[PDB]
Amino acid sequence: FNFSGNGNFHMFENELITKLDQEVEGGRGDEQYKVLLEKLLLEHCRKHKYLSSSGEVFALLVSSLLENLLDYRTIIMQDESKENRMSCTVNVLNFYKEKKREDIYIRYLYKLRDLHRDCENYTEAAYTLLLHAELLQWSDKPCVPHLLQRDSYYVYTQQELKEKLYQEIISYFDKGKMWEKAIKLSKELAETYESKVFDYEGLGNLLKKRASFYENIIKAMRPQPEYFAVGYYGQGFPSFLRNKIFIYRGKEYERREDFSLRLLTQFPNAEKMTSTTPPGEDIKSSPKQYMQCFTVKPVMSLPPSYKDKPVPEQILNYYRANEVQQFRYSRPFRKGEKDPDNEFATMWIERTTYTTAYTFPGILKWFEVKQISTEEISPLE
């Protein structure tokens, strides 16, 4: 800080964070450790003048890390399900992305790549690797040594690195039976070839594969995943679960309560809410974690540029299930006089809107919901 009078200590705390990470994730730290860390630095900052607040909020960063890291480990070796692991490693990816230590963000990004790569979520492996690929650029210069992967390490003109990345992402979608994004990427890949590097052979092989993609799309037919909504209520949950609602991309042919079974597996306290539509206020506070499962409706996409065109079937069926971010759930409900001969005299449907953060498929086979709302439908309608 005597040096920071001319410059900064920021380099210091950078590798501090870096190291600190590798050890704590490596499986050493303690929670009282962070408590004491915090304490001591607070005291010594009080011993120091003005910079005290600066250093202390930097330590707050440090703390935030530490508690999240220990939460990571406690879940990793408490629940022992790949999926909570995926949730928490996503949590750390987020946390760093906000904290902008992009390199370690990449590091866990590859970690989660390893995860999904184990579990054949070719789609999610591809997307995550693609969030990596995004940070890179189509320039030539290998600019900063962070972004370099952990498979080898030398210059890798970031142009070439991005090129590799696309090779593998395309590979994933190919075996991931989702060729539309595959072609989408193949566009940039060929264009960058022919406009910056003129490696025509790359062009040739690439668009050969692109032909394979178009053929396999319009030729075959694809199963569609059921979409289930889950809302974790009670009080015992990990905080990021209690009294939230999540939405799931199950198997293609998994009926509702098979998914319910698989989720109860995930959990102790296998108790289900039964009024599947509304939450329960007493459960908003009471312990003994609750949940409820019910399939929901994948709102149709809005295929751009297809607004009226004589679009074939495969195109529409593919947009039917994917790139989805709206969801409804139709509510049978009596409103009026309940004639015996008919059911229609009262049918009022309060379909529930489900606006989540992102669009399936994603980096995660599920997601939260960001916003919900209802409706009200006349039997006329």
């Binding site: 199963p223 042919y253 009926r255 599947t276 019910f294 049978p332 049918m347």
Partner: protein, 177 residues
């Protein structure tokens, strides 16, 4: 990739409609959508390979016996049905349905399926049965009737539960396959 026809009939006081519609709808028990059309369908993977299937959901009144046999050919399996808590359904099936469906497609796997398993053990309901001399007839004699035909299988479900309902349809589809 393939498809499978099947028919379902049963007593008209029970509306197996609710069974099939809640199943394919996959919605919550006792919260299903009642439609305006019959003859429901399902595309389900059972074991390894997915298969489509559509269920000829037919009206069961006897005067509708004159339209039903027109769809009898190539009925891959049939689903004969009743209500556990309805001895009247027992009479219906044993006396009309069982005999004439056995006549009509004598060589095709058949599974009888229960109903109102929840109602079969509703104490107020069964006490009404006794104060109306209806017998809350249980499984084992139902299985005995299954043996009476020696049906390739027999089960029960309950709409307000979906209990075994999945399994009901599981054996249903895998009987063909």
């Amino acid at each position: 990739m393939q498809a499978i026809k099947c028919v379902v009939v049963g007593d008209g006081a029970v509306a197996k409609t609710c069974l099939l519609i809640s199943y394919t709808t996959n919605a919550f028990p006792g919260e299903y959508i009642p439609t305006v059309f019959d003859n429901y369908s399902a595309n389900v993977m059972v074991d390894g390979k997915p298969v489509n299937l559509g269920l000829w959901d037919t009206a069961g009144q006897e005067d509708y016996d004159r339209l039903r046999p027109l769809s009898y050919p190539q009925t891959d399996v049939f689903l004969i049905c009743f209500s556990l808590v309805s001895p009247a359904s027992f009479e219906n099936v044993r006396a009309k349905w069982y005999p004439e469906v056995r006549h009509h497609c004598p060589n095709t796997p058949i599974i009888l399926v229960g109903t109102k398993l929840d109602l079969r053990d509703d104490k107020d309901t069964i006490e009404k049965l006794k104060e109306k001399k209806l017998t809350p007839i249980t499984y084992p004699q139902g299985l005995a009737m299954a043996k009476e035909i020696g049906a390739v299988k027999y089960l029960e479900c309950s709409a307000l539960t979906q209990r075994g309902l999945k399994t009901v349809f599981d054996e249903a589809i895998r009987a063909v396959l």
